[PDB]
Structures are given as C-alpha cells and as structure tokens.
Amino acid sequence: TYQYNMNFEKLGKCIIINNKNFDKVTGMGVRNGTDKDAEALFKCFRSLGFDVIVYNDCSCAKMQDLLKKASEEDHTNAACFACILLSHGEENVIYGKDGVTPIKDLTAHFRGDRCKTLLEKPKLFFIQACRKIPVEADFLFAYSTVPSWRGRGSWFVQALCSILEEHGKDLEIMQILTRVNDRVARHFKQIPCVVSMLTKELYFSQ
Amino acid sequence: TYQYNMNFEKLGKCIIINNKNFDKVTGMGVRNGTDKDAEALFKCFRSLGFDVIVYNDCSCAKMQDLLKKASEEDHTNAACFACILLSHGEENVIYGKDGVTPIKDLTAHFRGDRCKTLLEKPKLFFIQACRKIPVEADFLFAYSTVYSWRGRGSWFVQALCSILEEHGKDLEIMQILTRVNDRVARHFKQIPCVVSMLTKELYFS
Numbered sequence: 001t002y003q004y005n006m007n008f009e010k011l012g013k014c015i016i017i018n019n020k021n022f023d024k025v026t027g028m029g030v031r032n033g034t035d036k037d038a039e040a041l042f043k044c045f046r047s048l049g050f051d052v053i054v055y056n057d058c059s060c061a062k063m064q065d066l067l068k069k070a071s072e073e074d075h076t077n078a079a080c081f082a083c084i085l086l087s088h089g090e091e092n093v094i095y096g097k098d099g100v101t102p103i104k105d106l107t108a109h110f111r112g113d114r115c116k117t118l119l120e121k122p123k124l125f126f127i128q129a130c131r132k133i134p135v136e137a138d139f140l141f142a143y144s145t146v147p148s149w150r151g152r153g154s155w156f157v158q159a160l161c162s163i164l165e166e167h168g169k170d171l172e173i174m175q176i177l178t179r180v181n182d183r184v185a186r187h188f189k190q191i192p193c194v195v196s197m198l199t200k201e202l203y204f205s206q
Numbered sequence: 207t208y209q210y211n212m213n214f215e216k217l218g219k220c221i222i223i224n225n226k227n228f229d230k231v232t233g234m235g236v237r238n239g240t241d242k243d244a245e246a247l248f249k250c251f252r253s254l255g256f257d258v259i260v261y262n263d264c265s266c267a268k269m270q271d272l273l274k275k276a277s278e279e280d281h282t283n284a285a286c287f288a289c290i291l292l293s294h295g296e297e298n299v300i301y302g303k304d305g306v307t308p309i310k311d312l313t314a315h316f317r318g319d320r321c322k323t324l325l326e327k328p329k330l331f332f333i334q335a336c337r338k339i340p341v342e343a344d345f346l347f348a349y350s351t352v353y354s355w356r357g358r359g360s361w362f363v364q365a366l367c368s369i370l371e372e373h374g375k376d377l378e379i380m381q382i383l384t385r386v387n388d389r390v391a392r393h394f395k396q397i398p399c400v401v402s403m404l405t406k407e408l409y410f411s
C-alpha cells in the first residue's frame with residue numbers, strides 16, 4: 001500500500017558513469033578517487049540486486065545517448081532504475097569529457113511521458129559533482145553537495161556505500177540518504193542534498 | 207541516536223505567512239482560499255505542538271524582516287522551528303505585497319553560522335508557490351511543485367493537513383511528506399518536491 005512494489009523479476013538497471021578524464025579544452029581536471037567510487041558503487045549496487053553497468057570517460061553525447069537508449073528499453077520486469085553520475089559539475093549541469101550537459105536533460109528521458117515502462121517506479125539518481133499520473137512523480141535525486149569534496153575515495157560515496165553495505169536491505173531510502181547526510185556532515189565540511197518526488201517508501205527487498 | 211531530539215520545553219515557533227492580497231503596482235493576484243489553507247495549517251501545526259503565528263499579506267520587507275527577527279530569538283528550549291509560506295512564486299523567489307524577495311534570503315537567516323540556538327535542530331520550510339556540523343545542514347524544504355494549483359483549499363495543503371491531522375504524532379517527516387506527494391499526484395496533475403538536508407529522523411514527539 002505504502003511500499004513501492006518490489007514483486008518484480010529484477011530490481012533493475014543501475015547505470016554508473018565514471019568520468020575521470022576530461023579534454024584539456026574544458027579546463028577540468030583528472031578526478032582522482034573516482035575509480036574507487038565506481039568500484040564501491042558497482043559492488044554495492046550489485047549486492048542490492050541491480051544489474052550494474054559502469055561507463056568510463058563518457059562524452060556528453062554518449063551520456064545523453066545511453067540514458068535515452070536505457071529509457072527506451074523495456075522495464076516492465078524491473079522494480080526501479082538507478083543511475084549514478086561521477087563527474088564534474090556546475091549549477092544545474094554535469095560535465096562530460098567534451099563539455100557540459102544539463103542534468104535535467106539527462107534525467108528527462110525517464111519522465112513518465114517518455115519511459116512508460118518505468119512508470120510508477122523509483123527513478124534514482126545519485127550525483128557526485130561540484131554543485132492521470134504526473135510525469136516527474138516517482139523520481140529521487142541524491143546530489144553530493146548542496147548547490148563536492150573527495151585519492152582515498154570521496155566522502156559522499158564512501159559513506160553512501162558504507163551505509164548500503166550494512167543497512168541497505170533493511171532501511172528505507174530516505175532513512176539511508178539521511179544517514180549519509182549525517183556521515184558526510186559529521187566527518188568523511190559539506191552537506192549532501194536529497195530531493196524526493198517519490199510517492200511511496202522504497203525498500204530494496206522483500 | 208538516529209531520531210532528532212524532541213525532549214525540549216517547546217517544539218518550536220511556526221511562522222505562517224499567508225499572502226492573499228498583492229498590490230496593484232506589483233502585478234500579482236489575489237490567492238483566494240489561502241486563508242482556508244492558512245487556517246488549515248494553523249490548526250495542524252497547532253495540534254503538533256507549534257507556536258503557530260499567522261501574518262497576512264506581508265511585504266517583501268516584512269517577510270525578510272519577520273524572519274530575521276525570528277532567527278535572532280532564543281531556541282535553547284525549542285526542538286525545531288517551522289515556517290510556512292502561502293504566496294505566488296517564480297523560480298528562486300517568493301512574492302510579497304510590494305514585489306518578490308529571493309527565498310534564500312528568508313532561509314539564510316537560520317543558517318548554522320547565524321542562529322546558533324537552532325543549531326543541529328530541524329529547520330522546516332513549507333512553501334506553496336501558486337504558479338563540526340555544516341551551515342546548511344538540517345534544513346528541509348517542501349515545495350508544492352517541482353505550476354501549483356488551487357477557493358476550497360489547495361491540493362498540496364489539503365493533503366498535508368489531512369496527513370498530519372492523523373499521522374503527525376506517529377510518522378517520520380519523510381514518510382508524511384511522501385504520502386503528501388502521493389495524495390497530490392493521484393487524488394488530483396502536479397507533484398510536490400521535497401528537499402532534505404536533515405541528518406536524522408524527524409518525529410514530532
């Protein structure tokens with residue numbers, strides 16, 4: 001009634017996009033520790049139940065392509081869809097190897113009026129970068145820093161993954177991300193932000 | 207450990223700001239039924255434990271001031287502090303009688319480096335736009351929209367109050383708001399947004 005329904009063949013796709021290396025032209029730098037964060041995330045979301053795919057040094061044009069192609073896929077048998085972005089960022093834009101794409105444009109592909117197969121199911125978006133059913137319902141964003149600090153990993157992620165490894169299967173999504181906020185805030189300063197359009201409670205299990 | 211602490215003399219002040227009437231020179235419109243919502247809200251946050259106070263048709267002047275005066279008060283005996291805005295809106299700006307004041311201005315007053323006594327305590331902001339602890343930690347915003355549609359109440363408020371009317375004292379803040387995001391979407395379509403920098407679970411008891 002109040003859980004999001006999990007009685008699905010699969011938990012879902014989980015697209016990690018690990019941009020470490022950027023063209024000189026951007027002025028952005030090699031992002032060190034991102035590899036440690038893709039691994040943490042890759043493994044954590046494997047354990048959860050997600051069919052993880054890690055993209056690497058992904059270009060703005062292939063960030064926009066692979067998410068569109070992922071939204072055109074059939075999700076009829078998936079409980080949700082996660083997507084995880086590990087790049088550089090500015091107000092309302094994630095970076096690629098060749099430039100910047102608006103984050104809203106990347107997520108738009110999974111809107112209800114486009115990705116009918118992910119209707120009524122959580123669309124999760126986690127971002128580590130420096131900054132008659134409605135369509136935008138059943139979305140959720142976890143940005144690393146309120147409008148992002150990290151070779152020994154990054155704070156938001158080291159923490160996100162710690163918390164999923166233990167309570168990931170026994171705690172609601174907001175209970176988790178909240179605990180990730182306290183962890184980042186106390187020590188790991190910055191504070192992570194969480195936007196929820198979710199209309200139900202998201203447990204990754206039973 | 208993981209719940210926010212409520213063992214305080216008071217739950218906190220709750221400033222409701224009910225802009226129904228907007229000046230001619232300003233171009234904004236009557237938001238009619240905001241008084242049904244403000245009252246709806248007055249009772250809900252009254253039952254919860256809040257010292258709700260309703261100011262009506264404020265100036266952008268009065269708002270930024272009225273929130274500055276509020277941040278400077280003493281909360282050592284308060285568990286949190288609530289605030290509710292019922293005006294017209296556009297992007298990162300709230301409206302008044304004389305114009306618009308950016309919302310960051312209203313909230314900044316309660317940042318960790320300003321209001322030492324509401325530190326590590328929930329700062330709650332509910333907003334209906336019709337059309338080593340960090341500084342920005344422990345705020346929560348509930349916008350009514352990501353338009354926002356409304357006499358006879360408005361959808362966002364109607365639901366928020368219903369859900370609190372019952373589950374206010376036995377449900378975490380995010381669970382409540384998650385239900386308020388469901389009712390607004392299905393029963394009526396638009397969707398409310400919820401921003402949490404909370405670092406703990408917020409129960410009103």
Ligand SMILES: O=C(O)c1ccccc1Sc1ccccc1S(=O)(=O)N[C@]12C[C@H]3C[C@H](C[C@H](C3)C1)C2
Nearest residue numbers: 146147298309310311313314315317341342345347
């Ligand atoms: O500094 C505080 O006032 C502040 C204090 C505590 C929490 C957040 C903030 S900011 C703020 C305040 C109110 C509502 C939303 C935000 S926000 O988290 O989304 N931050 C921005 C930062 C810039 C100015 C304005 C519009 C846009 C760009 C986003 C607020």
